[PDB]
Ligand binder design. Structure first.
Ligand SMILES: C[S@@+](CC[C@H](N)C(=O)[O-])C[C@H]1O[C@@H](n2cnc3c(N)ncnc32)[C@H](O)[C@@H]1O
Ligand SMILES: CC(C)c1nsc(N)n1
Ligand SMILES: [Zn+2]
Ligand SMILES: [Zn+2]
Ligand SMILES: [Zn+2]
Length: 426
């Protein structure tokens, strides 16, 4: 009993469309990955299986590349890990690119695993590769990835008989480029990458009618707007804090298409995103490169230092609605939360609220979680009426974007009940 179906679109390959009208919040599909792996910066910081950042992680005794929070996670991961383990070990000093480790797990899954429910609607076989649109620059990078895969996997895979029938590594990597999902933890931090072939039927819109959220490696696909019968289902492949020009470059470079949506035609929100003096936000955009690199490696004290140099610069400053200033405020907030600097975190967090309202319209999981963070900071600091407003706002959003099937809704409900009990006591 599904409310969605595969169909051949007029000009964007295959897509997913509603078989019946859908309401905001409706669960449309849920999937474990065909294959997934922790990303580089989070390796050794989060559990390889559940992708949570425990304080204590045990590394696998053979390879010592995979780390686990528990015996339970080590066992649930052993089928997925058992053959890559010998490869990671054979290349003891070197570590492969995420894409290479991912495709290794794909190969082992397809060779050794039962048919995956993640492929119910659409299989890895079926995925778009866009090879006839790749630049020769891109094709050259794919060729290098193929040779990297051949090197990394030589201990377990020496020839084609150990690959699925007529499995082509070049085409496989081309598929990974435009069908990889960035797995986010409950705090919306990027922690892993995975393939969800059924979900890969969703085409892109900068104004989508559906949204995905992750609960560990588990993916929930939900409607975030009313959707009519026969209407194509879309998600936004990209970060919302991007101008139309930046979205153009990514959708070209990674997904090989020219976005024609109404937002890109109208340059919707571009002007407000780039307010302030250009030479200032050019420098911030450059600094953000290393800030996000540091954040990807959970380097919070260094993240905070770079952000303070910007937020409290002795030189000219930017409005908080400037998307680069906004990104800096958000990184500083997360840094302060992880360093226990809760007053400072709330200062930065509250500054992001109105910009997030503008740039994450409707029901977007990123805004829901941001508002929940702010409400939780306020609750801990005894600002109950303010916390309650933000916690209910987060619930308004996340009952649509997350739903009862996501464990964070249970946590939010408990915060609401705690905050309400404090307000009632008077
Ligand atoms: C995750 S797949 C989506 C399903 C894909 N259409 C298929 O047939 O398998 C992403 C690819 O679909 C195409 N695509 C996605 N969104 C598009 C859009 N809005 N306009 C044109 N092509 C799009 C691009 O080729 C992109 O690389
Ligand atoms: C049980 C083992 C051989 C396995 N099944 S799927 C995968 N990646 N590994
Ligand atoms: Zn775990
Ligand atoms: Zn291992
Ligand atoms: Zn667009």
């Amino acid at each position: 009993p599904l409310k969605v179906e595969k169909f051949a679109t007029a000009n964007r390959g295959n897509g997913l469309r509603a078989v019946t009208p859908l309401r905001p919040g409706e669960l449309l599909f849920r999937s474990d990955p065909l294959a997934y792996t922790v990303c580089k910066g989070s390796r050794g910081v989060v559990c390889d299986r559940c992708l949570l950042g425990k304080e204590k992680l045990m590394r696998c005794s053979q390879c010592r590349v995979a780390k686990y929070c528990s015996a339970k996670c080590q066992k649930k991961a052993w089928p997925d890990h058992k053959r890559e383990c010998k490869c990671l070990k054979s290349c003891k000093p070197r570590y492969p690119p995420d894409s290479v480790r991912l495709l290794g797990r794909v190969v082992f899954k397809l060779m050794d695993g039962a048919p995956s429910e993640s492929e119910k609607l659409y299989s890895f076989y079926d995925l778009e590769s866009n090879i006839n649109k790749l630049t020769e620059d891109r094709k050259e990078g794919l060729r290098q990835l193929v040779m990297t895969f051949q090197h990394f996997m030589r201990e377990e895979i020496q020839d084609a008989s150990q690959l699925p029938p007529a499995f082509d590594l070049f085409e496989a990597f081309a598929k990974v480029i435009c069908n990889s999902f960035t797995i986010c933890n409950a705090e919306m931090q990027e922690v892993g990458v995975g393939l969800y072939p059924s979900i890969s039927l969703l085409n892109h819109s900068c104004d989508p009618n559906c949204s995905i959220v992750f609960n560990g490696p588990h993916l929930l696909l939900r409607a975030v707007r009313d959707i009519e019968v026969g209407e194509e289902l879309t998600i936004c492949y990209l970060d919302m804090l991007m101008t139309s020009e930046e979205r153009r470059k990514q959708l070209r470079d990674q997904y090989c298409f020219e976005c024609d949506c109404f937002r890109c035609q109208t340059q919707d929100k571009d002007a407000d995103m780039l307010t302030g003096d250009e030479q200032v936000w050019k420098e911030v955009q450059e600094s953000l490169k290393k800030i996000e690199e540091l954040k990807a490696h959970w380097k919070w004290e260094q993240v905070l230092a770079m952000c303070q140099a910007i937020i409290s610069s002795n030189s000219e400053r930017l409005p908080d609605i400037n998307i680069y200033q906004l990104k800096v405020l958000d990184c500083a907030m997360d840094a302060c939360i992880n360093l226990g600097l809760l007053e400072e975190a709330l200062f930065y967090g509250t500054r992001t609220m109105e910009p997030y309202r503008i740039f994450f319209p409707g029901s977007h999981p990123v805004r829901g979680v941001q508002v929940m963070k702010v409400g939780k900071l306020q609750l801990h600091q005894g600002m109950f009426p303010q916390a309650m407003k933000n916690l209910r706002l987060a619930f308004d959003i996340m009952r649509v974007t997350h739903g009862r099937e996501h464990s964070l809704i249970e946590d939010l409900i408990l915060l609401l009940e705690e905050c309400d009990a404090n307000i009632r006591a008077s």
